[PDB]
Amino acid sequence: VETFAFQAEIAQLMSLIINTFYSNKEIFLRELISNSSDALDKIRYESLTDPSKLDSGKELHINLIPNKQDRTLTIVDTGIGMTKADLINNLGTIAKSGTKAFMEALQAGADISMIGQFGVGFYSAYLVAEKVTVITKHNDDEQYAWESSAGGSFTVRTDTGEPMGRGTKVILHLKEDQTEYLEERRIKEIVKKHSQFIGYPITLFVE
Amino acid sequence: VETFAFQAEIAQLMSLIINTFYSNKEIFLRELISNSSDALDKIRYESLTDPSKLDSGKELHINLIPNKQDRTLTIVDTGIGMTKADLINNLGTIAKSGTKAFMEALQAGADISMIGQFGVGFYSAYLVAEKVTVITKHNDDEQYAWESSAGGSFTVRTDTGEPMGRGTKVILHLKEDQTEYLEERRIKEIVKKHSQFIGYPITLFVE
Ligand SMILES: COc1cc(Cc2nc3ccccc3c3nc(N)nn23)cc(OC)c1
Numbered sequence: 001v002e003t004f005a006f007q008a009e010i011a012q013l014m015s016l017i018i019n020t021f022y023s024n025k026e027i028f029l030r031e032l033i034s035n036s037s038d039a040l041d042k043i044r045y046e047s048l049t050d051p052s053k054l055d056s057g058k059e060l061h062i063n064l065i066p067n068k069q070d071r072t073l074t075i076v077d078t079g080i081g082m083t084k085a086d087l088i089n090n091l092g093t094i095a096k097s098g099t100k101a102f103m104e105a106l107q108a109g110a111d112i113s114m115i116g117q118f119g120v121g122f123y124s125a126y127l128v129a130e131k132v133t134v135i136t137k138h139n140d141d142e143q144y145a146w147e148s149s150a151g152g153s154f155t156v157r158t159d160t161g162e163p164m165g166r167g168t169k170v171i172l173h174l175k176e177d178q179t180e181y182l183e184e185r186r187i188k189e190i191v192k193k194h195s196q197f198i199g200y201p202i203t204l205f206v207e
Numbered sequence: 208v209e210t211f212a213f214q215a216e217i218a219q220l221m222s223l224i225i226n227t228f229y230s231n232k233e234i235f236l237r238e239l240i241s242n243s244s245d246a247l248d249k250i251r252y253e254s255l256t257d258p259s260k261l262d263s264g265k266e267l268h269i270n271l272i273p274n275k276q277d278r279t280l281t282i283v284d285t286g287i288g289m290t291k292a293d294l295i296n297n298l299g300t301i302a303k304s305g306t307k308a309f310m311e312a313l314q315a316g317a318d319i320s321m322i323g324q325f326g327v328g329f330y331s332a333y334l335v336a337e338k339v340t341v342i343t344k345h346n347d348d349e350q351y352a353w354e355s356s357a358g359g360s361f362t363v364r365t366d367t368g369e370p371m372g373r374g375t376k377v378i379l380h381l382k383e384d385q386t387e388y389l390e391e392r393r394i395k396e397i398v399k400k401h402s403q404f405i406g407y408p409i410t411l412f413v414e
């Protein structure tokens with residue numbers, strides 16, 4: 001298990017998301033579904049010139065899985081997935097400029113719900129989750145687990161759980177007061193409101 | 208010069224865009240700027256693992272160029288650009304499913320401004336343009352010119368104009384009654400309203 005420090009700017013963003021009083025927390029779901037849709041778009045596009053890229057699974061979809069026993073909400077996609085280099089370096093590099101723009105927009109009167117316009121919507125997970133675990137598998141790379149409870153550090157290890165084929169599972173370990181996002185009614189409401197035209201099937205699992 | 212038929216579903220979409228009474232035409236600009244931003248995101252991401260991909264130009268930006276003598280508004284980006292296969296086959300293949308979803312959403316009460324949510328925002332160009340010409344250059348491929356005035360066909364040829372390095376120029380040959388989109392005031396207004404947080408510099412050229 002390897003431990004890494006977030007760049008100062010990302011740690012600062014995560015602290016803002018965790019500390020700022022902001023009641024409209026439900027937007028985390030739209031941001032993660034959007035991220036899944038983007039990853040699904042990428043593998044779909046790649047498959048048009050190299051069909052063998054779908055040997056790891058032809059189905060392009062999103063699953064939403066609540067688990068009350070674990071207090072987790074999991075967003076699963078069969079998108080392109082992420083490499084070790086994405087997890088350690090690439091995503092953070094891209095996120096630096098978006099974070100700067102977002103935090104400047106916030107000082108100028110924008111609000112947290114606009115986070116996705118800056119390409120850093122992933123971190124909105126911290127509105128509802130005390131810990132986020134990400135399991136991901138890219139073609140021609142190993143299955144990895146990324147994890148962070150904020151506090152300035154994240155970990156990456158090779159994952160030895162159930163093999164996933166290709167894609168990403170974002171596991172939200174929900175804060176004690178955020179268990180409404182395990183309720184079928186509440187998830188259905190939020191998907192209808194903010195994610196109604198996503199171009200891939202979204203299946204909400206039942207407990 | 209090669210001439211191709213649009214798929215029936217795309218021709219149908221273009222006819223809907225051209226024929227439907229819909230006053231909120233200004234949204235074409237947001238859709239094309241969004242497309243440029245996406246292409247810029249792609250080359251930026253690629254460059255992180257292969258720096259030589261920016262040998263064709265390091266600057267990542269968007270230019271908006273009006274020309275009253277030609278009655279054109281040109282949207283230029285230094286994004287990843289498009290291949291011959293993109294222009295002839297790939298983009299149309301992806302667009303088929305999005306078109307179906309969009310046209311179904313329209314029958315259910317959605318409006319034309321939501322076109323971007325279905326990944327077919329490019330065709331919104333036909334709200335204001337009688338002809339659209341696209342000049343594009345991808346790394347390791349030739350510079351191409353795509354062109355269509357709708358009517359069910361488009362053309363692709365190798366471009367012999369000024370070499371562009373890398374990226375895409377979308378040239379909108381404006382309809383006679385749509386010359387307001389050449390006015391500096393009007394473009395500035397529209398960019399401020401719909402494209403205010405794009406993560407790349409947008410330069411509006413003056414005539
Ligand atoms: C900036 O930090 C991030 C951002 C993301 C969003 C993100 N980025 C990607 C980049 C390339 C290929 C696939 C994906 C991707 N798939 C999914 N589901 N999210 N996601 C995911 C993430 O997981 C640890 C960290």
Ligand SMILES: COc1cc(Cc2nc3ccccc3c3nc(N)nn23)cc(OC)c1
Pocket residue numbers: 242243246284286287288289293294298299302327329341353375
């Ligand atoms: C569906 O039909 C389309 C769609 C587009 C949008 C589009 N698609 C891309 C795909 C891959 C790489 C770059 C781009 C791209 N750059 C830009 N500016 N638009 N654009 C552009 C287009 O130009 C002829 C036709």
